[PDB]
Amino acid sequence: HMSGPRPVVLSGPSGAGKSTLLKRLLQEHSGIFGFSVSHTTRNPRPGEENGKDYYFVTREVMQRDIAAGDFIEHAEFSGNLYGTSKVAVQAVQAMNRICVLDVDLQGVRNIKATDLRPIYISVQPPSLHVLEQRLRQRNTETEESLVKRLAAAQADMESSKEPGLFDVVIINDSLDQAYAELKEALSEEIKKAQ
């Protein structure tokens, strides 16, 4: 489906701000934006909600839907499978809202190969050291997973400066400042939706 407004792809390292900032945007501008609820095979963290943060399913279940052609894209990340189902994006487009997707670098490249034509925004930590401190606070990962995640985060930070990859790269040192910059990047789309 190409109808409805242009979507928005948010990326950057997990834990560096993209998810928190998106939740804030969806609260302030709930009539304008809708979130694409990805499927994942990883286990839920405390406070996450099925059908809101992710559809939490097993590998077997996700594999059946993949085999059926139900996904726009999918990726392996730190031992688990993640993906954007067709229906997740279509549900938001049907409400005539701006669909926001939160994906890793592989998902950015996956979506670049589709016909969705989104705006791409990367949310970066001030440093890998700061990101590591934040990840170890909630401590939701095994050490093996944290090692894979920190390597992926480093690769993400290195690719963030690639010419033409992202429309805007936001450095999240302060959530209030980064949130202002997220809306700045979307300000024309927000005004047109209004």
Ligand X SMILES: Nc1nc2c(ncn2[C@@H]2O[C@H](COP(=O)(O)O)[C@@H](O)[C@H]2O)c(=O)[nH]1
* Residue 83 in contact with ligand X, rule: CB under 6 A: yes
> Is 97 labeled as catalytic in the residue annotation?
no
Tell me the closest approach of the beta carbon of residue 191 to ligand X, in angstroms.
27
Among 32, 6, 22, CA closest to 118: 6
**Contact between 17 and ligand X per CB under 6 A:** no
- Select from 8, 9, 17, 84 the one that contacts ligand X (CB under 6 A): 84
Catalytically annotated residue among 45, 59, 117, 136: 45
Active-site pick, 59, 64, 134, 138: 138
Number of residues engaging ligand X in binding (CB under 6 A): 15
Q: Using the rule CB under 6 A, is 9 a contact of ligand X?
A: no
Q: Is 24 a catalytic residue?
A: no
Ligand-binding annotation for 46, yes or no, is yes
Query: Which three-class secondary structure state does DSSP give residue 8?
Result: strand
- Nearer of residues 141 and 189 to ligand X, judged by Cβ: 141
Distance, in Å, from the CA atom of 182 to the CA atom of 194, rounded to the nearest integer, reads 17
Exposure string (b/e) for 38-64, b if CB count within 10 Å is 16 or more? bbbbbeeeeeeeeeebbbbbeeeebee
Q: CA 164, 69, 97, 174: dihedral to nearest 10 degrees?
A: -50
Residues forming the active site:
45, 138, 149
Residues annotated within the binding site for substrate are 38-52
